[PDB]
């Protein structure tokens, strides 16, 4: 009924924090995002997760980091958390130099490809635009 | 108050 969270370690929590983007992307700088990665750092620290902040990665650096974390052994760990703080579009996260599909980042942690994580919760937290609609709200 | 491109 509930996942075994009694493993030797809570697990890995990766924070990818992107604030400044190449001129080629046209993406504005993300003021306020240092606060986000520092609020997430202390929050997941106190939850007994191993927090690694990475700053301003290109999109090949994003795919590299993810394949390397997928290749570590998490067998003494309960869960895996990945926090993506970027610009994005629907199905897409931006490196500093351009876009990459979200599914390419998460297919690295699939059960048949990250076996020390099979049967365990993999949690992707994604602060990123997914398009360009705006919500005008309602009266209540 | 910012957004995370312009369509």
């Amino acid at each position: 009924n509930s996942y075994k969270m009694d493993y030797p370690e809570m697990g890995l929590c990766i924070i990818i924090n992107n604030k400044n983007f190449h001129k080629s992307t046209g993406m504005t700088s993300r003021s306020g995002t240092d606060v986000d990665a520092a609020n997430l750092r202390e929050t997941f620290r106190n939850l007994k997760y191993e927090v690694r902040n990475k700053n301003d990665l290109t999109r090949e650096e994003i795919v590299e980091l993810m394949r390397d974390v997928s290749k570590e052994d998490h067998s003494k760990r309960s869960s895996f958390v990945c926090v993506l703080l970027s610009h994005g579009e629907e199905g897409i996260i931006f490196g500093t130099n351009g876009p990459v599909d979200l599914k390419k980042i998460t297919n690295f942690f699939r059960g048949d490809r990250c076996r020390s994580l099979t049967g365990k919760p993999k949690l992707f937290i994604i602060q990123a635009c997914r398009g360009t609609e705006l919500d005008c709200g309602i009266e209540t | 108050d910012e957004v995370x491109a312009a369509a």
């Binding site: 998460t106 059960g111 919500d135 | 108050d1 910012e2």
Partner: protein, 90 residues
């Protein structure tokens, strides 16, 4: 067990929509996710925690913009769960 099982995607915003961020305090969703994890990670199951985040962003935030088309705008995060069990942090 399917290869897609046991994946939980907590998106900051609904599909198709911008995500909003405050220049001093951070993104509306990350501000809310930590504040709810702080107060609730020892009590509630993860889905119920994320549901409090959803309520927090939907209720407490509205955009302030010098731009007519960007002012008075709202947001709701989007929980996508392929989890097969309940998730507790204790």
């Amino acid at each position: 067990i399917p290869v897609e099982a046991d994946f939980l995607y907590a998106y900051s915003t609904a599909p198709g929509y911008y995500s909003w961020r405050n220049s001093k305090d951070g993104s509306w969703f990350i501000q809310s996710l930590c504040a709810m994890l702080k107060q609730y990670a020892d009590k509630l199951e993860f889905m119920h925690i994320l549901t409090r985040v959803n309520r927090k962003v939907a209720t407490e935030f509205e955009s302030f913009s010098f731009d007519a088309t960007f002012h008075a705008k709202k947001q709701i995060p989007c929980i996508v769960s392929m989890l097969t069990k309940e998730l507790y942090f204790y």
